[PDB]
Enzyme design. Sequence first.
Site, mmCIF file in Angstrom:
data_model
loop_
_atom_site.group_PDB
_atom_site.id
_atom_site.type_symbol
_atom_site.label_atom_id
_atom_site.label_comp_id
_atom_site.label_asym_id
_atom_site.label_seq_id
_atom_site.Cartn_x
_atom_site.Cartn_y
_atom_site.Cartn_z
ATOM 1 N N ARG A 1 0.824 -1.217 0.000
ATOM 2 C CA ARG A 1 0.000 0.000 0.000
ATOM 3 C C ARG A 1 0.853 1.259 0.000
ATOM 4 O O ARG A 1 0.443 2.291 -0.569
ATOM 5 C CB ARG A 1 -0.994 -0.017 1.159
ATOM 6 C CG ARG A 1 -2.031 -1.099 0.996
ATOM 7 C CD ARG A 1 -2.857 -1.279 2.257
ATOM 8 N NE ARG A 1 -3.724 -2.467 2.237
ATOM 9 C CZ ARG A 1 -4.880 -2.572 1.581
ATOM 10 N NH1 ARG A 1 -5.356 -1.574 0.839
ATOM 11 N NH2 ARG A 1 -5.567 -3.706 1.652
ATOM 12 N N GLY B 1 -14.349 -3.232 0.895
ATOM 13 C CA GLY B 1 -15.730 -2.811 1.095
ATOM 14 C C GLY B 1 -16.116 -1.681 0.161
ATOM 15 O O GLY B 1 -17.241 -1.607 -0.315
ATOM 16 N N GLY C 1 -10.776 -10.060 -2.746
ATOM 17 C CA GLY C 1 -9.519 -10.355 -2.084
ATOM 18 C C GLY C 1 -8.879 -11.684 -2.417
ATOM 19 O O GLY C 1 -7.693 -11.732 -2.783
ATOM 20 N N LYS D 1 -20.726 -17.201 -0.698
ATOM 21 C CA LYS D 1 -22.098 -16.904 -0.334
ATOM 22 C C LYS D 1 -22.788 -15.807 -1.146
ATOM 23 O O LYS D 1 -22.180 -14.791 -1.525
ATOM 24 C CB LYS D 1 -22.141 -16.525 1.147
ATOM 25 C CG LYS D 1 -21.851 -17.709 2.045
ATOM 26 C CD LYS D 1 -21.838 -17.319 3.493
ATOM 27 C CE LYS D 1 -20.557 -16.565 3.858
ATOM 28 N NZ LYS D 1 -20.793 -15.099 4.086
HETATM 29 N N1 LIG Z 1 -18.123 -24.475 -3.785
HETATM 30 C C1 LIG Z 1 -17.642 -23.853 -2.697
HETATM 31 N N2 LIG Z 1 -17.983 -24.328 -1.483
HETATM 32 C C2 LIG Z 1 -17.498 -23.719 -0.391
HETATM 33 N N3 LIG Z 1 -16.714 -22.640 -0.318
HETATM 34 C C3 LIG Z 1 -16.387 -22.190 -1.522
HETATM 35 C C4 LIG Z 1 -16.808 -22.732 -2.762
HETATM 36 N N4 LIG Z 1 -16.286 -21.990 -3.798
HETATM 37 C C5 LIG Z 1 -15.570 -21.040 -3.226
HETATM 38 N N5 LIG Z 1 -15.607 -21.123 -1.860
HETATM 39 C C6 LIG Z 1 -14.888 -20.257 -0.895
HETATM 40 O O1 LIG Z 1 -15.112 -18.897 -1.176
HETATM 41 C C7 LIG Z 1 -14.142 -18.166 -0.401
HETATM 42 C C8 LIG Z 1 -13.844 -16.892 -1.126
HETATM 43 O O2 LIG Z 1 -15.076 -16.212 -1.309
HETATM 44 P P1 LIG Z 1 -15.109 -14.646 -1.258
HETATM 45 O O3 LIG Z 1 -14.504 -14.208 0.067
HETATM 46 O O4 LIG Z 1 -16.527 -14.247 -1.444
HETATM 47 O O5 LIG Z 1 -14.153 -14.245 -2.487
HETATM 48 P P2 LIG Z 1 -13.275 -12.923 -2.561
HETATM 49 O O6 LIG Z 1 -12.442 -13.038 -3.860
HETATM 50 O O7 LIG Z 1 -12.435 -12.857 -1.317
HETATM 51 N N6 LIG Z 1 -14.383 -11.647 -2.629
HETATM 52 P P3 LIG Z 1 -14.438 -10.477 -1.388
HETATM 53 O O8 LIG Z 1 -14.429 -11.183 -0.054
HETATM 54 O O9 LIG Z 1 -15.759 -9.659 -1.710
HETATM 55 O O10 LIG Z 1 -13.154 -9.570 -1.512
HETATM 56 C C9 LIG Z 1 -12.944 -19.112 -0.229
HETATM 57 O O11 LIG Z 1 -12.675 -19.378 1.140
HETATM 58 C C10 LIG Z 1 -13.378 -20.390 -0.980
HETATM 59 O O12 LIG Z 1 -12.951 -21.619 -0.387
HETATM 60 MG MG LIG Z 2 -13.185 -12.714 0.604
#
Ligand SMILES: Nc1ncnc2c1ncn2[C@@H]1O[C@H](COP(=O)(O)OP(=O)(O)NP(=O)(O)O)[C@@H](O)[C@H]1O
Ligand SMILES: [Mg+2]
Length: 398
Positions: A36, A378, A355, A204
């Site tokens: 950063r 966020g 992320g 989710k």
């Molecule tokens: N089919 C699945 N079942 C369970 N967990 C899953 C599955 N596919 C992805 N994941 C989980 O989703 C998580 C990442 O989701 P998420 O935090 O929403 O993505 P991100 O790129 O970090 N987006 P953000 O948190 O908005 O910055 C990881 O820990 C994955 O293991």
């Molecule tokens: Mg995430």
Amino acid sequence: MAKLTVKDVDLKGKKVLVRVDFNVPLKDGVITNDNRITAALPTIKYIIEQGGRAILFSHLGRVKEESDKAGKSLAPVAADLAAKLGQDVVFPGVTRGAELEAAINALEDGQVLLVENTRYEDVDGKKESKNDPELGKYWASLGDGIFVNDAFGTAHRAHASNVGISANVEKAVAGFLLENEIAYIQEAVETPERPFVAILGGSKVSDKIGVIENLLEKADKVLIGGGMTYTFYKAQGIEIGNSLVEEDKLDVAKALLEKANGKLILPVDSKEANAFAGYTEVRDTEGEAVSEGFLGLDIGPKSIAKFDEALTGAKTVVWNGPMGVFENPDFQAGTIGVMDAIVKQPGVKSIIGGGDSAAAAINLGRADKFSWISTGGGASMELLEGKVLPGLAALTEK
Ligand SMILES: Nc1ncnc2c1ncn2[C@@H]1O[C@H](COP(=O)(O)OP(=O)(O)NP(=O)(O)O)[C@@H](O)[C@H]1O
Ligand SMILES: [Mg+2]
Ligand SMILES: [Mg+2]
Ligand SMILES: [Mg+2]
Ligand SMILES: [Mg+2]
């Protein structure tokens, strides 16, 4: 840009107030990741080069009581910045006061001062995080009527160090990094080169409902992957075995499908296993349905092929969320397959805004092929929801 930027104002000989993102990880007073700080440099260097006197503000971590100040001083950051700039960074160690004011007055053209952690002001009454009127007015009074916001990561919140200062200066303008975040995360979505394909994944549906709604209006197609898949499946009566689902969001999922008018594209298969960890069988589903006793942990090969075809000829792509449990090598194919399908599209403007998604791209050797990787967290989400963020509202119109 429609807001003023730092290039739109005359800086020579002026005190220039700058909100930068120096919220770096520390362990025992030591910076463990300077990304950063590096990312902040272009704006800082530009102000120096123009003969401005840079007065820098940042938070670091969270500070609720006096004892929390320990460990969260910006002292090590001032030292790091000075090394990167090749010049001194003045660091009085205070957030307010006559000594700070005296130190600012002494800055010559091209010099830099760093104010102490803005969240030190949160100890008595959350003045920074709750945007105490007097604090914003005070920090603004340290300058010469120009504030540069270069911290997209707090733009979604109204703090003294962004909106407070902005409310009390003549010109509040975007820095280079925030300008790019706005360009890619707002304007490229609102006014996309088409086809615009959005891809949403991760664990989710609940944390992405607003983004799905907005992108269903703005994009030509929205591809869904990750755990979010199984909430959509369950809403349709499809068996999902032991997959991650939010039963409290089945109705919203059903409603998004109904309103999507064919724009919402679900996986048509999964790679499933008979445990989340310690599994002894992994296999592809024949189709949408997950087997009893199993759970879906990645999109399957037919889905990777279908998404690849959906991406053909895309000119804009926004991606947030892995297609599967990317932490695990057995469930990386879906995410890798989608990344490669994105970045191969000619002339595509490809934008990552999550992320784990950015981490995956970097870890697996694809990140350098994307146009923009957002680090706004966020703020990135709220902007993809189509909200007017207070830190942006507060900027002066061009
Ligand atoms: N089919 C699945 N079942 C369970 N967990 C899953 C599955 N596919 C992805 N994941 C989980 O989703 C998580 C990442 O989701 P998420 O935090 O929403 O993505 P991100 O790129 O970090 N987006 P953000 O948190 O908005 O910055 C990881 O820990 C994955 O293991
Ligand atoms: Mg995430
Ligand atoms: Mg402009
Ligand atoms: Mg099928
Ligand atoms: Mg108008």
